[PDB]
Ligand SMILES: CC(C)(C)c1ccc(C(=O)CCC(=O)O)cc1
C-alpha cells in the first residue's frame with residue numbers, strides 16, 4: 001500500500017501563475033516530453049531521472065529537489081479524476097497526497113480536465 005506522505009498536509013506552496021496545459025508538457029529546461037514531474041511546491045515541470053542505459057530523462061526534477069528541498073512531485077499524464085502518481089524525494093517512495101486536488105488547483109489545475117498518457 002502507498003502511504004500518506006508526511007508532507008501532504010503541511011506542504012507550503014508558492015504562488016506560480018503560469019498556465020499548465022492538460023496535455024503536451026515539456027521539461028522547462030530540455031526537450032524531454034516523457035517522465036515529467038510537477039513539483040507541488042513551486043509548479044516546476046522538469047524531467048525524470050536518467051535510466052542506466054542513458055535513456056529516460058535528464059535528471060532535471062531530481063536536481064531541482066537537491067537544490068531546493070521541495071519534496072513532492074506528481075507525474076504528468078498520470079493525473080485522473082481518481083488521483084495520480086505522487087513521488088516523495090524526501091521519503092524516497094510513491095506516496096499518497098490526500099490534499100492532491102487542492103495542491104493542483106493551487107496552480108489552476110482541474111483534475112477532471114488532465115489527459116492520461
Ligand atoms: C519508488 C520508486 C518506484 C522506486 C521510484 C519512482 C520514481 C522515482 C523518482 O525519482 C521520480 C522523479 C524523478 O525521476 O526525478 C524514484 C523511485
Ligand SMILES: [Zn+2]
Nearest residue numbers: 027030047060
Ligand atoms: Zn529536462
